[PDB]
Design a protein around this ligand. Structure first.
Ligand SMILES: Cc1ccc(-c2nn(C(C)(C)C)c3ncnc(N)c23)cc1
Ligand SMILES: Cc1ccc(-c2nn(C(C)(C)C)c3ncnc(N)c23)cc1
Lengths: 283, 283
């Protein structure tokens, strides 16, 4: 089927010797993958050991999780930008599939924020770096689909790295990705039209960006707090949106609202978003 | 879309007052659901409190997980058999969706087995009770799809209860369920034709039953140990199968093999399986 084809094609510059990789503690688990801290000997021109992160399948992986890991690999090969996690390689030939990437010292953005108390200007800087990465992926004709504080990494120097490319889809031909069956993206980050109509575009990424803004501004808050996901259908189509959080300027809130406009064409594009944020920074 | 329709239809005998339910410790998490121990006051004719288990959505649920929880509910309403977990009710009207079911004192079959050392006759008894439940579901025209030691519960008296109906599908019309996108069932329990062709039938359930037999016989072993899931495509179609485990009679092994025949029509049906196991019991 489509997977056996991919697996067979795959098994036929990115390959890294398994014997040169040493895995250590588990850094995190989750939807399709398990991530461990690791070290790699003689990695792509670097002398000695480099500290890296490695994603692999969890116990009892499904075809869906295998497909997602292969897809993330496929996407990460094609992208290169200061605000996107950097791929080093993979181990495929011996043992389970292992993807080797840049280690982000501070872990997830959500974790980093929740450990915090950081200025409003640090917050705007974070959002803006993410918007630049997103402007780059949108130019590559990729829809990311799973943008969220938990899927952004914070590297040395508090650099934002957009991560978790397992659900990212190429939209070169149509400028949208449409999925017949139900999505595996949390409902509380999905655009109204993704939720109801299974349509994903750069503008649905912009909606998710608005929820990410809310997460940044609340320092890792939980969106629509105390509201069950199943209530989102009706809440959204009756035109409700999250209220301005505490510690949020009105210009920041105004931007969140614009990202959550019902009509996708009415939301800003990532380039507008970046301009808006740089402007808040300098004022 | 199909989900908003279900959620709206749903929100329009099974309903239980949220105020009569008290939730306690987390019993387990996993693919679509979180399960907690709980107590329910005046549950369906029972005076006083009854100890129950409750499944709900995990944090950051996706449309796919919501759909699976609704589907499990829908299936559990229609089934009733001594070897299938019994539904009591749900809380929907206030707060998150909660499904209230029979509490299984010994937890999952896999956990129960791994805590063990139990006779061969206890083992055959377990398999046989599960085969009876499965013979009943097959007669109801349901394909279970996710049969595995982790999805069988052990209740008071060491009674097997088939559980986790989120992926079960009605096959009344065609005797098969076909899924275009990748399955969320672990690859190591899937029939060769489910893995390659996305076709699910009672006979693919029989394959999974063979893997479950292997799990019972090894006391909760890990199938195809040390073999990565992606190697299963080629291993399976080149005709390889797991070797006879230690502490396994040849008749038991012969049954596993028959469940794993390439041609689905060549595997036994659950009624043959039950006859085979009762025969091993009495001999
Ligand atoms: C392909 C791939 C590999 C690793 C990661 C990743 N996840 N995570 C967690 C989720 C533990 C914060 C990480 N933490 C630090 N550094 C990383 N590189 C990661 C993401 C994608
Ligand atoms: C709808 C539904 C509700 C609960 C369970 C369930 N899962 N589990 C675990 C997985 C913790 C062993 C249970 N353990 C004991 N009793 C139970 N009833 C369950 C399964 C399905």
């Amino acid at each position: 089927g489509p997977l056996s084809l991919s697996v067979d094609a795959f098994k036929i510059k990115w390959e890294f010797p398994r014997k040169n990789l040493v895995l250590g503690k588990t850094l995190g688990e989750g939807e399709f993958g398990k991530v461990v801290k690791a070290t790699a000997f003689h990695l792509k021109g670097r002398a000695g050991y480099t500290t890296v992160a490695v994603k692999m399948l969890k116990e009892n992986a499904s075809p869906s999780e295998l497909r997602d890991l292969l897809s993330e690999f496929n996407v990460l090969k094609q992208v290169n930008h200061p605000h996107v996690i950097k791929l080093y390689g993979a181990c495929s030939q011996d043992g389970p599939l292992l993807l080797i990437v840049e280690y982000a010292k501070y872990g997830s953005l959500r974790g980093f924020l929740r450990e915090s108390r950081l200025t409003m200007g640090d917050l705007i800087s974070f959002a803006w770096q993410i918007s630049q990465g997103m402007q780059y992926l949108a130019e590559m004709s990729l829809v990311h689909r799973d943008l969220a504080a938990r899927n952004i990494l914070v590297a040395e120097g508090r650099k934002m790295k957009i991560s978790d490319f397992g659900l990212s889809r190429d939209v070169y031909e149509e400028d949208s990705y449409v999925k017949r069956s139900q999505g595996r993206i949390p409902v509380k980050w999905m655009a109204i039209e993704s939720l109801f109509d299974h349509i994903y575009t750069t503008q649905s990424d912009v909606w998710s960006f608005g929820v990410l803004l809310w997460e940044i501004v609340t320092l890792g808050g939980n969106p629509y707090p105390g509201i069950p996901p199943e209530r989102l259908f009706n809440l959204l189509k009756t035109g409700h949106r999250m209220e301005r959080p505490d510690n949020c300027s009105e210009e920041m809130y105004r931007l969140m609202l614009q990202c959550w406009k019902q009509e996708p064409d009415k939301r800003p594009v990532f380039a507008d978003i970046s301009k808006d944020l740089e402007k808040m920074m300098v004022k």
